[PDB]
């Protein structure tokens, strides 16, 4: 659907990953990275998760 729709779905997903400590610990442990660093990666991804908008 619209680029906006996909963008919102992804931003909601990243927000949820940062929000639920168990999931965040799971993913960060899988990557063997500190939980805070993974949290920062996820929050940073919210800028443009997918491609740039259409013109």
């Amino acid at each position: 659907t619209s680029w906006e729709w996909k963008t919102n779905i992804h931003r909601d997903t990243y927000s949820s990953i940062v929000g639920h400590p168990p999931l965040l610990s799971y993913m960060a442990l899988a990557q063997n990275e500190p939980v805070a660093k993974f949290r920062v990666q996820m929050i940073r991804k919210m800028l443009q998760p997918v491609g740039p908008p259409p013109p």
């Binding site: 400590p21 168990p22 939980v35 908008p53």
Partner: protein
Amino acid sequence: NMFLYSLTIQPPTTITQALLGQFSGTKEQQIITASGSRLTLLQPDPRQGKVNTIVSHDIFGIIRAMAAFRLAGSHKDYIILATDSGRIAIIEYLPKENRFQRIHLETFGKSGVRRVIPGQYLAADPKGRACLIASVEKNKLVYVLNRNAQAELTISSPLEAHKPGVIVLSLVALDVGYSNPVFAALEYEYSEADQDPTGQAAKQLEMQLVYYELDLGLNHVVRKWSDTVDPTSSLLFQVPGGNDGPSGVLVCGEENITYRHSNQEAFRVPIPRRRGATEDPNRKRTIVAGVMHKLKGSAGAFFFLLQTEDGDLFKVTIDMVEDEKGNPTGEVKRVKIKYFDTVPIAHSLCILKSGFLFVASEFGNHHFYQFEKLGDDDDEPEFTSDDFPADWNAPYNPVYFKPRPLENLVLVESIDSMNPLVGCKVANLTGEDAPQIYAICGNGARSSFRMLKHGLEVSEIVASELPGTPSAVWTTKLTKYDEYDAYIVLSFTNATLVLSIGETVEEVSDSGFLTTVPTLAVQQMGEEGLIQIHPKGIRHIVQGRVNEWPAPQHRSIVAATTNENQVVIALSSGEIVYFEMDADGSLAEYDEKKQMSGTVTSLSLGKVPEGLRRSSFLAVGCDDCTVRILSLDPESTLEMKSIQALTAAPSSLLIMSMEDSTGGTTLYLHIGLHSGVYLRTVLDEITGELTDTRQKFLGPKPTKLFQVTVQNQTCVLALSSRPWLGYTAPITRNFVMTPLSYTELGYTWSFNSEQCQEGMVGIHANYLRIFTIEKLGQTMIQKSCPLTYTPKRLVKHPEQPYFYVIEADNNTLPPELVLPPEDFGYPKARGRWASCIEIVDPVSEEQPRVLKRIELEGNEAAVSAAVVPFASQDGESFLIVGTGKDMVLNPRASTEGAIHVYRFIDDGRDLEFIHKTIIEEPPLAFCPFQGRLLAGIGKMLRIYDLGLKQLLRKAQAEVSPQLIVSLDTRHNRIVVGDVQHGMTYVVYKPDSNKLIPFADDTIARWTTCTTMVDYESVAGGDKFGNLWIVRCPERASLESAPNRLDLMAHFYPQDLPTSICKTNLVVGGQDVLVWSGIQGTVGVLIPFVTREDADFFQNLESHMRAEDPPLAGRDHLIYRGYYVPVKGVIDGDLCERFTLLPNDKKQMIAGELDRSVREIERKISDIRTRSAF
């Protein structure tokens, strides 16, 4: 229509946040921790160097943030909780009641963890004047906290500070002294990035530090100040303000620390890089956690402890310009970083005023350290803002440091944490009655293999030979004012031995030739004298002068119970003789004796109730399977008060008053049956009738009862095949019987001495022992051994007591090809894997041990494992390992997968590598299927057989929509767990050699673990914290995409399930579902026996939902049905909070449920102890 009861065997042991505060109101400091949904209050002990848990409380919500604040002119901190309730809750701890109580609860939004609803961030003004709660985007709310005329807390309505497009990475409150409160935030706006169609406006971040000033006068909030900071900035920290320092925040980003306040210049310092040979040079690092501490007795005198992503702790300080004299000014000059010490990576760090550091590890055990601090003071290089460039883009030269063992800190306690719990299995590797729970957890070199055993931990002080097998023991004081009881007595089938305090003992008084049935010193407040009753008389000993009660009839003494002021004996004829005490002389025998229909098998007199002359009741058990209560009052002596019939002959009796769940002592009669049964009844204290019977089965041996004292609490010690301790739990306040992790005992008695107090003495098989149960409450004992890398799976040898763990640390080079990795971490390297197999022997020795390690190579990592028997090999079981090469998780990257095959040698104590067979993608799931191997590779379900040089395909098909993560099977049915699309039921057609999928899941489920409970249904969990059970419809089950599975149960434990299995936890044999959670939970789902029990616990759960709502304002039914509504499961964690209520609530619920309070208690305890523990 309910059928499952959810209970918690082990609560989560993670700590996503720990906070320091004077929560008790005293000047002492306490620690508040968030463990998933548990709010826990801990008391550090500076003398013992340990930390003890004061209380824990299930929020029935998600604890996302915590803040502490103090009211003006008060010494007590309150706790603000930011959770998923959509509400802000402010709670207080009550030391008199040892419970949490919330003092404010106000709704500000809808429930859940959502993007635009605050809860993610929470900060509080240091002076306690206001607080700010915020979401990731974009809402912020400020609540003003004030003090009313009543001196109570008052909360204003929130003040909005929203701004669309704003993403927050960090939020801390500024210490502006008593100026207008200011909150600092790291923010970036995405509004521009959405407007640039191609090109960007992205791949770049315009991070700003923003100040939100709260004007208390005008009661509004405004973006007062802001500026651009380092785009890599991720953390903020509060620097002291007002007189204690210049207000501001350390901004922390990639190799960048900055003071960066509004009325000050910028001051940049870099992060030193490790100088190790394995350590990659020119590798930048960031900060993960940090603490600020202000030292007492001095202005300023503040430092920072900041932690790198490797776990290295650097001390940061601030130096300000001096005047003409030697005094500071408000202007800041430099920022000094100095290497401090390396500790595990932590979610929170806390510096106690008593000179300790509490480290809440993000993974693995938690750490408690004591400061020193010896460096040597300038042994470590120090680096300042002189003259590193305040500009982040400006060039500069890197700086290095050499890590080294602890100098400033000393470890004083390691705190058991099963976080992260990768998996567990339930199995019985010993002859013990209860299976054990084996679990793999930890991360890195701090990982661990742990075994949990249901029992109480007891420490044996001495042991000795006798050598003849004694049949009884006692300890007794010559005098009623001796704190240390003098004597220890033993009894054999034809003799008696007497000991005492000290190193060795022998005889001075007492009759040593004949067997002795009891020993007590009758006269409290009358120093002289013990009694030794034996067959054929009662010897009274007083300062060496001896006067004995003759038998004297042809009959002999067959049983006897003794009390301080009273003595009761039972003869072979069935007559009962009662002795009370005058001003001098224990021979005040009653003129009359009481005849019994049969032979007396047990007697219990009960201690003397203080403030009274004598115990009013006597318990008499007979061989006619009856227990009677006879009166001992003077007016109606030896008249029968009550009687009860029993399932078997009573072998033991013990009258004892214990603390009850309602805050006052109660008089109970413990009964021990000749069949191994233990009962506890209530003695009415007036009419002497017995009510509210509790039962339990302890073992085949006849149960015996004794009274001991543990932790200043009077407890019952029941001896059966095992020793069980019945006590009132200190925190949860219910009545528990837990077995001892100790040898079978035939006799025990309370023991005292100068060396140990409130200990115990017991005998078994030519041995005497002295032990004490130092601390109770923890019903699960845990033995552990370290592992090499972060575990992934756990499999058991099919016949021998051995385990095999596959382990894989991502983004780590093989340690090779001087610093202990558990203390400093393996050397990190991007894209490189470190993996290994380890064989674990958990039972053969006192502690689990790793027998052998098998290191992998070739950038190859283990991801799955199974023990599979092959028909082609006459049924021999082999070890199957799945691996991947050059694995990158996001996005998933396939160089190649592989399946190693190993063979069991030396009964499973070692492995022989057979052959390795390469495949397309890493195989995430294995499963034994009809004498051959089942593997899941990609979306591919594949059957292999064992060949001479490779595994050989025999059939395959695509079954799952995106990726296989789990497999299980019964008969011709295979159940396939997809990484995202839930379950898929496949059937195997032998004549056609086809794998046909015939059922799939309705909704998406990010499966993490599965098991088959029967042929038709599968129980599993998903990564969003759900447990569920799906089932194949009966119409589609006869078919041996097209059909949809039915949903049979669903439940939100909140913790992420990592493993699940169907097993039996108790000899009683009720099949249960045991599961484990990433945060440390070990839980059970228990099926109800009858519809009546299901109804009782459903209605009990409703009333507990009304009278004990979740602390943080959640709705319990909505919480347990976070994603999809609750189906089939009753939350027993809530039900078990019934014991915590005030008595009026208990009586109300007892009214609505039409059962007595003691009955509700008994059913709650019963459902747990019968089917699990």
